Amino acid sequence: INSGTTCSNDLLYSNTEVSTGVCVNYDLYGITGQGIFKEVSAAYYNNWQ
Amino acid sequence: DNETLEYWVTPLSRRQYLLNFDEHGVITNAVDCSSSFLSEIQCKTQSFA
Ligand SMILES: *[C@@H]1O[C@H](CO)[C@@H](O)[C@H](O)[C@H]1NC(C)=O
Ligand SMILES: *[C@@H]1O[C@H](CO)[C@@H](O)[C@H](O)[C@H]1NC(C)=O
Numbered sequence: 001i002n003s004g005t006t007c008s009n010d011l012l013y014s015n016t017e018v019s020t021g022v023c024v025n026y027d028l029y030g031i032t033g034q035g036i037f038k039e040v041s042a043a044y045y046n047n048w049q
Numbered sequence: 050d051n052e053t054l055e056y057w058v059t060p061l062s063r064r065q066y067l068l069n070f071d072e073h074g075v076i077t078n079a080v081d082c083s084s085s086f087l088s089e090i091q092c093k094t095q096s097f098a
Contacts, residue, residue: 044074 003030067092 007030020037069078082092091097 049074 002032005029065092067095067097069097 013027018037018039020039023034023036025034026032026037065082067080067082068076071077078097080088080091080097082088
């Protein structure tokens with residue numbers, strides 16, 4: 001629950017931009033919460049992570 | 050040419066390990082928590098040293 005790509009479209013919203021530096025509510029592919037984003041240069045993600 | 054076939058098999062069970070992840074996210078070390086006394090100390094401190 002709250003993670004994956006089997007999604008229910010009963011409440012449909014449009015995709016927004018990932019805005020950085022401000023406190024936001026987020027719903028990232030099921031993951032929900034509140035926080036501040038910061039764009040980074042990461043090299044530790046494989047093709048399945 | 051002095052080649053050999055090898056296929057080593059051991060059984061699996063559900064058990065607790067302590068894993069060490071490095072800077073790149075690679076598993077480098079593991080300890081089975083119920084195998085020895087030092088492994089019990091390592092799993093109760095959550096430290097490899
Ligand atoms: C605080 O407010 C300023 C606008 O005055 C904004 O640029 C900044 O991102 C805000 N800080 C946070 C953490 O939201
Ligand atoms: C294979 O092992 C035998 C041992 O009697 C040796 O004489 C032979 O040279 C070896 N061949 C190779 C390719 O290593």
